Symmetry: C2
Subunit: 118 residues, 2 copies
């Protein structure tokens, strides 16, 4: 019975609950079980760190996407890579400092429009 | 006096295939009213570019959608990071949803269905 608990303990962790379990609302009780269901012990006691070191990357990706940068850059090239990378930096910077993605994305759209009309 | 050029391209942007597949669709930026965007394109892209874009655009439409899907479906986490979902599963899922949107399915609506089949997978 122990194992089920040892991990049930990590999901109940605060760092997890606030940084992963709850956050991933982008689709809570259940999710927890799903995680419980999918990931094994060793995995659990190893994810958070790896998680924090990829939170930036995952957000830039989301930004690139949400900011229609696949078209504006990769395809149409209406925006310089430099401009794009920069913009992704700044906004990611924000979100990583507590800024609500939702709200941050709005600011990124703003700065984007700026660039486009330049 | 290079008026002609301004027209030649204004012609392409006013094309149908463009208006429907690019100019209009790219409303994802609060689309600052299509009108503007069009001028932006007019302002940024040159002539050679314009009479070259669409085909190039059609051949990437798929790739760009998968990207959007991967993102919207929190796959950076579910796969690349946590590995809660097999790559095989992931790719398959992106395929079918993309298949849909490519066949006219409204992204919005299509993503919802992908969310569904995802949950399914997660609960397996």
């Amino acid at each position: 019975e122990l194992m089920r608990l040892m991990k049930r303990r990590i999901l109940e962790s605060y760092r997890w609950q606030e940084d992963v379990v709850k956050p991933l609302s982008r689709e809570v009780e259940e999710f927890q079980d799903i995680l419980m269901d999918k990931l094994d012990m060793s995995s659990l006691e190893a994810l958070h760190p790896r998680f924090e070191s990829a939170r930036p990357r995952c957000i830039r990706e989301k930004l690139h996407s949400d900011l229609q940068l696949c078209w504006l850059v990769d395809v149409m090239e209406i925006i310089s890579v430099d401009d794009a990378e920069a913009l992704k930096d700044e906004i990611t910077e924000l979100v990583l400092a507590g800024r609500e993605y939702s709200e941050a994305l709005s600011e990124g759209r703003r700065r984007l429009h700026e660039i486009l009309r330049s």
